[PDB]
mmCIF file of C-alpha atoms and ligand atoms in Angstrom:
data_model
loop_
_atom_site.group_PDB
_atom_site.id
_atom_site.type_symbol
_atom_site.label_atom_id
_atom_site.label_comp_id
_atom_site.label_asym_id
_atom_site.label_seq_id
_atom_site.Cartn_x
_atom_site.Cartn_y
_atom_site.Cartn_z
ATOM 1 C CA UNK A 4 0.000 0.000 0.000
ATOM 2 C CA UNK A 5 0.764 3.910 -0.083
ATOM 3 C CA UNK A 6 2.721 5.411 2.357
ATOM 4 C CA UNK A 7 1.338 7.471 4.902
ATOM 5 C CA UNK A 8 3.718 10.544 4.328
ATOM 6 C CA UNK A 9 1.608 13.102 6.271
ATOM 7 C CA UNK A 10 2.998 15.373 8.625
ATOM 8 C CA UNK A 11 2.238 15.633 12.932
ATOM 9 C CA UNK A 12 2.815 18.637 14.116
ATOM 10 C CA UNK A 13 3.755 18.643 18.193
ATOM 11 C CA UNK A 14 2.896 22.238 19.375
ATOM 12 C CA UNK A 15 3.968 23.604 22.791
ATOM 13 C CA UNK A 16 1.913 24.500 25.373
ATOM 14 C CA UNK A 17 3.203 27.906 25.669
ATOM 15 C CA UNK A 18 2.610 27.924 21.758
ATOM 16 C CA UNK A 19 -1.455 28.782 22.370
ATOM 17 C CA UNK A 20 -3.964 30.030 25.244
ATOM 18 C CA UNK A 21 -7.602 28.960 26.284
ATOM 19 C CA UNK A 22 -9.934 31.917 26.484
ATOM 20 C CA UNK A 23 -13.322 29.425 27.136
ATOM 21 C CA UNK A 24 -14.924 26.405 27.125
ATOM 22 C CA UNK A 25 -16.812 25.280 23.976
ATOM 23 C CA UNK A 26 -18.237 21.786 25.576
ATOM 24 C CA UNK A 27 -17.450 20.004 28.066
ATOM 25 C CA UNK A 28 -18.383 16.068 27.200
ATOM 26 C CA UNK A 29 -18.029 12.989 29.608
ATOM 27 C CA UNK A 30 -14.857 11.992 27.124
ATOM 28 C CA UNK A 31 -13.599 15.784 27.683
ATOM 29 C CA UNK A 32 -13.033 19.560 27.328
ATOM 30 C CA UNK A 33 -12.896 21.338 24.096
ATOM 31 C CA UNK A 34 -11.529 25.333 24.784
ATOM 32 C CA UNK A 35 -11.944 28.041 22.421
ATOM 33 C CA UNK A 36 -8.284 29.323 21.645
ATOM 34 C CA UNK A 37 -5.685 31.387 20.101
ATOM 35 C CA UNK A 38 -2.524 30.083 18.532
ATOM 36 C CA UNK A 39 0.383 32.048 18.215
ATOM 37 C CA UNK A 40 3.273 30.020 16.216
ATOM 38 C CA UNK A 41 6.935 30.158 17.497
ATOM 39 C CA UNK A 42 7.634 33.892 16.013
ATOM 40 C CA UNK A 43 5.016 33.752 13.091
ATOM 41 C CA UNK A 44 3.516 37.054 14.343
ATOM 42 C CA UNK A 45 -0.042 35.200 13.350
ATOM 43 C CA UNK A 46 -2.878 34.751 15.975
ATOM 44 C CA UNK A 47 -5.088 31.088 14.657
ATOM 45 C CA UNK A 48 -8.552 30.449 16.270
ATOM 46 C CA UNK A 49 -8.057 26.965 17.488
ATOM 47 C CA UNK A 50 -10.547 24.459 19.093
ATOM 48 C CA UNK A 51 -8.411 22.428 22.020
ATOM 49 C CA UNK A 52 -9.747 19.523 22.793
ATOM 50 C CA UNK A 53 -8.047 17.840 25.988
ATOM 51 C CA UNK A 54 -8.854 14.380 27.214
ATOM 52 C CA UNK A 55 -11.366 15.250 30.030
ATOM 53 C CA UNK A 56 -8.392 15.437 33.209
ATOM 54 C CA UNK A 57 -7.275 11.955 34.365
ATOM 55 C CA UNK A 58 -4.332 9.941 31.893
ATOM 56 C CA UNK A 59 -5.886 6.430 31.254
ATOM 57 C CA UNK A 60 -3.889 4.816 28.578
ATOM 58 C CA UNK A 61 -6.710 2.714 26.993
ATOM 59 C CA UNK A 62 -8.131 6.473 26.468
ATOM 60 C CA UNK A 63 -5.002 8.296 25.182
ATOM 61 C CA UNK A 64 -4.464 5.234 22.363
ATOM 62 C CA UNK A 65 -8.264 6.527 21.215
ATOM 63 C CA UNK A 66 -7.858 10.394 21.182
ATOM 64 C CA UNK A 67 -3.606 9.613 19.398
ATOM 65 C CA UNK A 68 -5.498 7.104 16.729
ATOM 66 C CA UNK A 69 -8.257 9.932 15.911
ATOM 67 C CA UNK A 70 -5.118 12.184 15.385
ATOM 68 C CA UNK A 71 -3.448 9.757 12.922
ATOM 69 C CA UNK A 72 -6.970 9.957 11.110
ATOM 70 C CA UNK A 73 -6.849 13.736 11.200
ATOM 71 C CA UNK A 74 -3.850 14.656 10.206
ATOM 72 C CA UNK A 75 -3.950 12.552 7.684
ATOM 73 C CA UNK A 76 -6.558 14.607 5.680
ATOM 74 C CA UNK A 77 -6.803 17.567 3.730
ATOM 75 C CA UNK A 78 -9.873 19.148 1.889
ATOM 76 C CA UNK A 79 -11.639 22.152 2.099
ATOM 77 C CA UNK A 80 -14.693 20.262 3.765
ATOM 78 C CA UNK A 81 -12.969 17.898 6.143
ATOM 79 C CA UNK A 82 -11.778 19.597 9.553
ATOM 80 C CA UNK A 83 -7.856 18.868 9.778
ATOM 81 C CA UNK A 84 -5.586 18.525 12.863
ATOM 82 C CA UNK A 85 -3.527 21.680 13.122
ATOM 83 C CA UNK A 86 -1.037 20.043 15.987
ATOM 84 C CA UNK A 87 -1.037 17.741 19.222
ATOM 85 C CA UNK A 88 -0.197 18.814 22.649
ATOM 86 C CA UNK A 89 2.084 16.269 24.386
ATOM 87 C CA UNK A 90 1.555 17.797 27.863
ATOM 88 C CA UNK A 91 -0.189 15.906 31.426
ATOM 89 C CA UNK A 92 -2.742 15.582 29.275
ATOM 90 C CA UNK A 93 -2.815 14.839 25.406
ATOM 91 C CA UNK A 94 -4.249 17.999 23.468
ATOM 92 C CA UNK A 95 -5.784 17.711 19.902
ATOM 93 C CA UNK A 96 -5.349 21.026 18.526
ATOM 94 C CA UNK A 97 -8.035 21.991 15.566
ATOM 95 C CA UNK A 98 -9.275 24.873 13.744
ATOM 96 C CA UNK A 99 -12.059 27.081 15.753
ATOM 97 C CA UNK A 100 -15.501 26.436 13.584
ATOM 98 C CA UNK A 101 -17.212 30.075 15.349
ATOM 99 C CA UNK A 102 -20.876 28.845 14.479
ATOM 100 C CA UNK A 103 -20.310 25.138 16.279
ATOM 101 C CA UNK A 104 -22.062 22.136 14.798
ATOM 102 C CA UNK A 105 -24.554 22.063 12.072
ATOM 103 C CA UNK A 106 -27.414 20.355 14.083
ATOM 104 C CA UNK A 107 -27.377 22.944 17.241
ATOM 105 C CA UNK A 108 -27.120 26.043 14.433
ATOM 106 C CA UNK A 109 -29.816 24.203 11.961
ATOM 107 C CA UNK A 110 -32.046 24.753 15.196
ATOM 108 C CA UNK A 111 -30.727 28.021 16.574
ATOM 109 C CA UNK A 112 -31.933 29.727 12.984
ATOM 110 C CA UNK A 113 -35.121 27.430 11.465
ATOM 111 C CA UNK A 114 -36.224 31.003 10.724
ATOM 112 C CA UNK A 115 -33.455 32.353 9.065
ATOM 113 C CA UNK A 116 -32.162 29.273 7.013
ATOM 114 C CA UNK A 117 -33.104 28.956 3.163
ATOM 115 C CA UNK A 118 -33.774 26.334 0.482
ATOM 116 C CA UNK A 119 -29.900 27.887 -1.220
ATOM 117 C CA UNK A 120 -27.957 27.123 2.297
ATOM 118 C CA UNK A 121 -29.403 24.029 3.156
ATOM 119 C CA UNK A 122 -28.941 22.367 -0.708
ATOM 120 C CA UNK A 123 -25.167 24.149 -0.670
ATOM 121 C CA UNK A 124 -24.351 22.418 3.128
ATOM 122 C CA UNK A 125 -25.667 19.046 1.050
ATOM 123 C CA UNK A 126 -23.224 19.506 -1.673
ATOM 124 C CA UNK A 127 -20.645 20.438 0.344
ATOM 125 C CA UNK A 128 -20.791 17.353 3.122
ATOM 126 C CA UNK A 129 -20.956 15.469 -0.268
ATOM 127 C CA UNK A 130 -17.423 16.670 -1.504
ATOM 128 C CA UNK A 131 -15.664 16.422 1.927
ATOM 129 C CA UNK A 132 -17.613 12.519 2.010
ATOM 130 C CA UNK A 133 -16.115 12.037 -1.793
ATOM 131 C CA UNK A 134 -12.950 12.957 -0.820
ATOM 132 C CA UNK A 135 -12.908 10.655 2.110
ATOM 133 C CA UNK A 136 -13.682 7.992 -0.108
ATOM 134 C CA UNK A 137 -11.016 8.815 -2.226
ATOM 135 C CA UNK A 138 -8.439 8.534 0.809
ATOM 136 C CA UNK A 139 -10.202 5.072 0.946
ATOM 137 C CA UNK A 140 -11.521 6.464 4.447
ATOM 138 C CA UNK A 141 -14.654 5.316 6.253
ATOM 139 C CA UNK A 142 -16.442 8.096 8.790
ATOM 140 C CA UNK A 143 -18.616 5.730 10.818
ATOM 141 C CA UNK A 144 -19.970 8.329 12.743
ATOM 142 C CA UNK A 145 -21.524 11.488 9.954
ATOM 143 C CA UNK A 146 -24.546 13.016 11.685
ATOM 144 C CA UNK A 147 -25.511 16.517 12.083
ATOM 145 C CA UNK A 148 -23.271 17.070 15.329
ATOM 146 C CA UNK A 149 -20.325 16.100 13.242
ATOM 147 C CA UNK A 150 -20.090 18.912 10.802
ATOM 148 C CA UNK A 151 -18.875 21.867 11.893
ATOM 149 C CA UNK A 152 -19.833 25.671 10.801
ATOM 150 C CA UNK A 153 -16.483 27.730 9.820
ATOM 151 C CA UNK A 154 -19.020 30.388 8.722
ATOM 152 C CA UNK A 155 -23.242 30.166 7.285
ATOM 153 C CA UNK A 156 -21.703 29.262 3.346
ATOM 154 C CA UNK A 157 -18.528 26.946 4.752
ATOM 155 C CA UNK A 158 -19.503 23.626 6.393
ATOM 156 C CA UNK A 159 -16.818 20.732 7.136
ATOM 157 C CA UNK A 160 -16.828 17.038 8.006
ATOM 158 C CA UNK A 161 -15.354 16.107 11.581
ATOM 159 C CA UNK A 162 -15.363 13.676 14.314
ATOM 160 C CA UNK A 163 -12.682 10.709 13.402
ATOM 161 C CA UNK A 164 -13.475 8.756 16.620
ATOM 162 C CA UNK A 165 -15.312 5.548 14.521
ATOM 163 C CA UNK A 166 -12.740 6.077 11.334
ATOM 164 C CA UNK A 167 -10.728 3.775 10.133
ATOM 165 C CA UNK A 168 -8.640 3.153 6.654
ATOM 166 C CA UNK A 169 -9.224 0.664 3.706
ATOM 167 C CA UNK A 170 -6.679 0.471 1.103
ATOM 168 C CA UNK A 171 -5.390 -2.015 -1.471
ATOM 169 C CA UNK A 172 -8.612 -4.593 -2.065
ATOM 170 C CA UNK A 173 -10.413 -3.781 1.374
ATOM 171 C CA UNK A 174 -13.982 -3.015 0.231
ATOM 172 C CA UNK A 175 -15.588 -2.993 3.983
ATOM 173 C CA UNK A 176 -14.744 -3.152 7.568
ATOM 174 C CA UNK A 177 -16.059 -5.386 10.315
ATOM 175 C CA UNK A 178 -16.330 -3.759 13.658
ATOM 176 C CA UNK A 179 -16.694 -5.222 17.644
ATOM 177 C CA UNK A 180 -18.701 -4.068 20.426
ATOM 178 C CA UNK A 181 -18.660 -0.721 21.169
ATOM 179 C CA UNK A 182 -21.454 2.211 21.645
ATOM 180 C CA UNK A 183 -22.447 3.277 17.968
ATOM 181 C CA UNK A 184 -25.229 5.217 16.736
ATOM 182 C CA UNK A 185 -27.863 2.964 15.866
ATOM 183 C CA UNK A 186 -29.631 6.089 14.517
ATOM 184 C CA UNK A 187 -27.767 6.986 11.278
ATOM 185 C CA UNK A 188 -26.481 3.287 10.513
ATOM 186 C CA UNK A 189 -27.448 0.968 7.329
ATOM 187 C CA UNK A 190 -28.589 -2.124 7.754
ATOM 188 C CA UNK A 191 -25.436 -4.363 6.855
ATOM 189 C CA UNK A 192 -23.987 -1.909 9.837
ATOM 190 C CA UNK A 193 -26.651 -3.045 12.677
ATOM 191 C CA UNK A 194 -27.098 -6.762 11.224
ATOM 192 C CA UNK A 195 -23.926 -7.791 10.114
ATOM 193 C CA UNK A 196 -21.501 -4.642 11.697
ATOM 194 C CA UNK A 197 -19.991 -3.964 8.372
ATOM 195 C CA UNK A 198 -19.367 -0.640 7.239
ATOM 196 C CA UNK A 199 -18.350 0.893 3.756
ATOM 197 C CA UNK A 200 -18.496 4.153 2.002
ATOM 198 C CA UNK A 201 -22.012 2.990 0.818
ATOM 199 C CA UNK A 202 -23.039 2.659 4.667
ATOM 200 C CA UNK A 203 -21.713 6.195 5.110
ATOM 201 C CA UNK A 204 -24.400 6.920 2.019
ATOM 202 C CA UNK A 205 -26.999 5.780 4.200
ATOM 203 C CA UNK A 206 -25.646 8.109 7.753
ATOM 204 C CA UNK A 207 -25.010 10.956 4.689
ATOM 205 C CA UNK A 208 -29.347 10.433 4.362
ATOM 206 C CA UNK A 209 -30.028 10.807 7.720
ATOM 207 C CA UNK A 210 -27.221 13.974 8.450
ATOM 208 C CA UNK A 211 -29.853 15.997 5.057
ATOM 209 C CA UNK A 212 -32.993 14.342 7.097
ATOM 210 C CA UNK A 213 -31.849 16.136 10.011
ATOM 211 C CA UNK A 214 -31.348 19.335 8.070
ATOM 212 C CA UNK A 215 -34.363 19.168 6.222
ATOM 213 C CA UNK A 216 -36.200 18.642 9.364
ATOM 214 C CA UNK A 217 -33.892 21.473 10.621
ATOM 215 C CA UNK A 218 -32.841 19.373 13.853
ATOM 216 C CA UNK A 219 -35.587 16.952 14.642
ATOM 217 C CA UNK A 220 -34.376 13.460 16.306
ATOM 218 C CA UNK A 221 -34.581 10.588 13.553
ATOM 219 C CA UNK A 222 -37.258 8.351 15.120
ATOM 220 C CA UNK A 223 -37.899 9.944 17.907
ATOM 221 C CA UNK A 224 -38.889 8.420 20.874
ATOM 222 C CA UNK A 225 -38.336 4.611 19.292
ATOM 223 C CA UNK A 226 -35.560 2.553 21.413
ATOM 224 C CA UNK A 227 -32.112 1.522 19.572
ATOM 225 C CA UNK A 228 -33.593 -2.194 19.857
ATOM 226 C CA UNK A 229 -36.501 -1.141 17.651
ATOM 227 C CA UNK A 230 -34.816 0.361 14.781
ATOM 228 C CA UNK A 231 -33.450 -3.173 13.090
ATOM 229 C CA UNK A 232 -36.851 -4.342 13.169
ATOM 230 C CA UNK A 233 -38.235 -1.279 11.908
ATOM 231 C CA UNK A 234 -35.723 -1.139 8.698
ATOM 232 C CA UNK A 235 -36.198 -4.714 7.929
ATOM 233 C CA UNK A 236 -40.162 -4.560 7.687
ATOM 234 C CA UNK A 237 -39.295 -1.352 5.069
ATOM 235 C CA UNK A 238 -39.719 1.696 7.341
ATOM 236 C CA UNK A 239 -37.986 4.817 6.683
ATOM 237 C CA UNK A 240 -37.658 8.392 8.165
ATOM 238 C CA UNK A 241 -40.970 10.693 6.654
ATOM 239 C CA UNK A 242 -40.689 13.386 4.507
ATOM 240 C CA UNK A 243 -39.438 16.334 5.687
ATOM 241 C CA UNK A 244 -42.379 18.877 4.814
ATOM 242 C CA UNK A 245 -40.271 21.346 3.186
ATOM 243 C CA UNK A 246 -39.112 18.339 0.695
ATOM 244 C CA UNK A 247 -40.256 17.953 -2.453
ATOM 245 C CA UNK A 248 -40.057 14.229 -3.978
ATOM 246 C CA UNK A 249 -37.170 15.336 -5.728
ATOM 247 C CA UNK A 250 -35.087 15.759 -2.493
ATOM 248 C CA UNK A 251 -36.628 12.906 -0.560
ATOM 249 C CA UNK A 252 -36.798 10.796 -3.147
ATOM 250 C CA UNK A 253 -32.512 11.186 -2.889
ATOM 251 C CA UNK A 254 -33.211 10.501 0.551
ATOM 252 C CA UNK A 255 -34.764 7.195 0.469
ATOM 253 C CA UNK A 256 -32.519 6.263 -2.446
ATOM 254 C CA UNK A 257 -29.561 6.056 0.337
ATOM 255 C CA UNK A 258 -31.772 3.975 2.167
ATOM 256 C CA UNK A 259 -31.734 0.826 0.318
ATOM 257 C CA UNK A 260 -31.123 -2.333 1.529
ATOM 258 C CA UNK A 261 -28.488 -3.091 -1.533
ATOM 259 C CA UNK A 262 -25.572 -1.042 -0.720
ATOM 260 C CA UNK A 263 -24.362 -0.891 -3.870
ATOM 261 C CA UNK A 264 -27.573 0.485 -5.322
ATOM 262 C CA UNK A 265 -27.609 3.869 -3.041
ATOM 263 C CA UNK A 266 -25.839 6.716 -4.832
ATOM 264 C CA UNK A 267 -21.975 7.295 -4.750
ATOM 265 C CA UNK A 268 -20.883 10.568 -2.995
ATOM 266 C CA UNK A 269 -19.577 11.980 -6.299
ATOM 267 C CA UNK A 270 -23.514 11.837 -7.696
ATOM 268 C CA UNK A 271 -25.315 13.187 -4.659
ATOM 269 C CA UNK A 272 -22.162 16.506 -5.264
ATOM 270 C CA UNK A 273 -23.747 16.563 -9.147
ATOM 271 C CA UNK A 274 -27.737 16.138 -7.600
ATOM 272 C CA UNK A 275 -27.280 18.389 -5.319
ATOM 273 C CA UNK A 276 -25.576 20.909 -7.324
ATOM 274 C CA UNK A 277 -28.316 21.239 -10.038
ATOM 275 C CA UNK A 278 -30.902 21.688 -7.045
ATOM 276 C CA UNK A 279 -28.529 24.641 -5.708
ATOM 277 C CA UNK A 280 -28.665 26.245 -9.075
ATOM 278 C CA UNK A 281 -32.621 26.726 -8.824
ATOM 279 C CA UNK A 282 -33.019 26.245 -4.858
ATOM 280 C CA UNK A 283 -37.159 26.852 -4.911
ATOM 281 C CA UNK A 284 -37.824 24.630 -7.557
ATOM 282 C CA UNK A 285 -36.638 21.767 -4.639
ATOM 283 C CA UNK A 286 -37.269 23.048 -0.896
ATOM 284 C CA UNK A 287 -40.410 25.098 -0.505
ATOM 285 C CA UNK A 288 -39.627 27.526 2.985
ATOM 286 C CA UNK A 289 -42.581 29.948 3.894
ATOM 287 C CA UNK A 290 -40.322 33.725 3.075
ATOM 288 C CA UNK A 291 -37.510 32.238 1.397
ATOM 289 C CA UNK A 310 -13.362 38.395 19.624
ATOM 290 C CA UNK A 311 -11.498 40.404 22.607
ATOM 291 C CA UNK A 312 -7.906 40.031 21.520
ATOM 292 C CA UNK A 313 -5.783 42.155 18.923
ATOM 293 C CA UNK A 314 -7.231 40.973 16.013
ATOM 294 C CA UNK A 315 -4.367 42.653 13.826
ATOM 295 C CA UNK A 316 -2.642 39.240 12.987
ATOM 296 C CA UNK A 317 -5.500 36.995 13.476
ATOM 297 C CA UNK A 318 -5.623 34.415 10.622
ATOM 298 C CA UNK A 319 -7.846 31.400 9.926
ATOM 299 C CA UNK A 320 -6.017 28.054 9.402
ATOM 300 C CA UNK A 321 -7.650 27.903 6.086
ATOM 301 C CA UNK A 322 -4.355 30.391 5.448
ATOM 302 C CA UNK A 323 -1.912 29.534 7.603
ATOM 303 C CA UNK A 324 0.273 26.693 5.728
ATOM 304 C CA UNK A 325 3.300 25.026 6.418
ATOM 305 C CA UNK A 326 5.379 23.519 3.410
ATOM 306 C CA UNK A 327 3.671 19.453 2.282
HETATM 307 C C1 4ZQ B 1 -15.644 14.841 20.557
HETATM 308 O O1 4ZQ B 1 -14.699 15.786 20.040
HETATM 309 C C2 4ZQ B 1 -15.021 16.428 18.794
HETATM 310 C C3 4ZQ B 1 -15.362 17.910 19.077
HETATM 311 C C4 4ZQ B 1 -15.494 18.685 17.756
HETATM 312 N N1 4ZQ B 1 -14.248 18.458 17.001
HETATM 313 C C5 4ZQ B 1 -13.740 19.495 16.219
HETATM 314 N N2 4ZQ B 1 -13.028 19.235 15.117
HETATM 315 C C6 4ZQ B 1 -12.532 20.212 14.360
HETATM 316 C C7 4ZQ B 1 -12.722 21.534 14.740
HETATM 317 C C8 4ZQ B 1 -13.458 21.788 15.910
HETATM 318 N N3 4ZQ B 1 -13.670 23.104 16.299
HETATM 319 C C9 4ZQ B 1 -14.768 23.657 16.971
HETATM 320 C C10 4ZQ B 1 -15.737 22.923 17.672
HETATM 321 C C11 4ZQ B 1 -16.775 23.605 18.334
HETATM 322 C C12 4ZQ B 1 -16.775 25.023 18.260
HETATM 323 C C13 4ZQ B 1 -15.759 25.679 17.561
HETATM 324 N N4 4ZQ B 1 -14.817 24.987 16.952
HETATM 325 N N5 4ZQ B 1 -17.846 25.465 18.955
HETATM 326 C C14 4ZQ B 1 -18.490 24.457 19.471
HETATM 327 C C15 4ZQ B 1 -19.745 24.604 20.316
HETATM 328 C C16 4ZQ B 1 -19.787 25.955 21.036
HETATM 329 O O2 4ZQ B 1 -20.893 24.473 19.472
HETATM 330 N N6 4ZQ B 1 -17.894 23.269 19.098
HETATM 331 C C17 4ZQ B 1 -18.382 21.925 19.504
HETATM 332 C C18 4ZQ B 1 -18.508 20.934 18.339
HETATM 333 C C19 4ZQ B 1 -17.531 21.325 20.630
HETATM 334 F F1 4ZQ B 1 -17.318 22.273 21.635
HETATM 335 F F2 4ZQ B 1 -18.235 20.250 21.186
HETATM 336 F F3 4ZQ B 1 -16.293 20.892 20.139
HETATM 337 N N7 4ZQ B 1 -13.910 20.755 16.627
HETATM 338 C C20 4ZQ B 1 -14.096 17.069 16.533
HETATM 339 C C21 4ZQ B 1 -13.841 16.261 17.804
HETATM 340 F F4 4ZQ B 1 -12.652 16.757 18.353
#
């Protein structure tokens, strides 16, 4: 196979500052943060994410293997590791995403979100999906919650905690135990726990369901336990009211039992994009920072040689 020639960056401590906290999971603490490079004279609005306080090792081989995923990605919808922290405490150092994830904001502005930003966020989790197919990568875990908000008209994929790497002739990946959302899996995922870039197709329905639906829970209020039995009789999630069939009709079509008749990631970017260009004709929507900001730059523009 290919070698892995990507770059880890080890960043000192002393190297950035925490000005809040973002969340604070049971897992950890992600801070809000500047980053100010050896002599750069830049200022980069980071997200730190430190393992929640106490150094397990069983914990610091997960949060050091969802680095090696990170780091070893680059698009302009994919969220990439800027730097670890090799302190008490291992650090994953990202770039700061100001409007959080897309589920919490799809719900903080139902009234203020149109048919031309919810088709372009499609598109774009599309490309950033493509691209991890391309790098033979498989997300595990896109929902929602996992794609960040740089700015209203920039969305990226995150979250490499379930991803794992292909290659060569490895067409799917068989998992263990482990909590996974029952939620946005495919069938072959719950049933069999084998997951592809087609069962990412099938999460990729669910993260636009959510969207469309501008944050409601998919099948809310039915227990984990239910949902197999639910798919296998041939229920899906309804149609989002502001959907016409055209939309949910792309929808269902990543809910199909046959993996390998959903659509490919590099279709739903060409779907999606001729819905964008005409944004009524498909989604019908009733009226449709403290510091010196002198040398503040966004990691989309702060690069180091590759
Ligand atoms: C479980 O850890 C996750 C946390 C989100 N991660 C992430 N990846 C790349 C960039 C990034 N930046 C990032 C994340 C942000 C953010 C600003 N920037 N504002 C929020 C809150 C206020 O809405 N969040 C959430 C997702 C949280 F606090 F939970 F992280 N955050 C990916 C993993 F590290």
């Amino acid at each position: 196979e290919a070698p892995n020639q990507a770059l880890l960056r080890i960043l000192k401590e002393t190297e950035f500052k925490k000005i809040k906290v973002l969340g604070s999971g049971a897992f950890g603490t992600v801070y809000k943060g500047l980053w100010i490079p050896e002599g750069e004279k830049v200022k980069i609005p980071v997200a730190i994410k430190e393992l929640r306080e106490a150094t397990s090792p069983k914990a610091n081989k997960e949060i050091l293997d969802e680095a090696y995923v990170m780091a070893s990605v680059d698009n302009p919808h994919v969220c990439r590791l800027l730097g670890i922290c090799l302190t008490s405490t291992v650090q994953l150092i990202t770039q700061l995403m100001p409007f959080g994830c897309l589920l919490d904001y799809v719900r903080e502005h139902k009234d203020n979100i149109g048919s031309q930003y919810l088709l372009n966020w499609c598109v774009q989790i599309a490309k950033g999906m493509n691209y991890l197919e391309d790098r033979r990568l498989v997300h595990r875990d896109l929902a929602a919650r996992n794609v960040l908000v740089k700015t209203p008209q920039h969305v990226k994929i995150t979250d490499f905690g379930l991803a794992k790497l292909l290659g060569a002739e490895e067409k799917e990946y068989h998992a263990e135990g482990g909590k996974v959302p029952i939620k946005w899996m495919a069938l072959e995922s719950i049933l069999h726990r084998i997951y592809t870039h087609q069962s990412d197709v099938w999460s990729y329905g669910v993260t636009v369901w959510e969207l469309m639906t501008f944050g409601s829970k998919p099948y809310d209020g039915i227990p984990a336990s239910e949902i197999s039995s639910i798919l296998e009789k041939g229920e899906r999630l309804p149609q989002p009211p502001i959907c016409t069939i055209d939309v949910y009709m792309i929808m269902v079509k990543c809910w199909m039992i046959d993996a390998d008749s959903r659509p490919k990631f590099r279709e739903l970017i060409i779907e999606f994009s001729k819905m964008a260009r005409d944004p009524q004709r498909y989604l019908v929507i009733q009226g449709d920072d403290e510091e010196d900001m002198d040398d503040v730059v966004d990691a989309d523009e702060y690069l180091i040689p590759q």
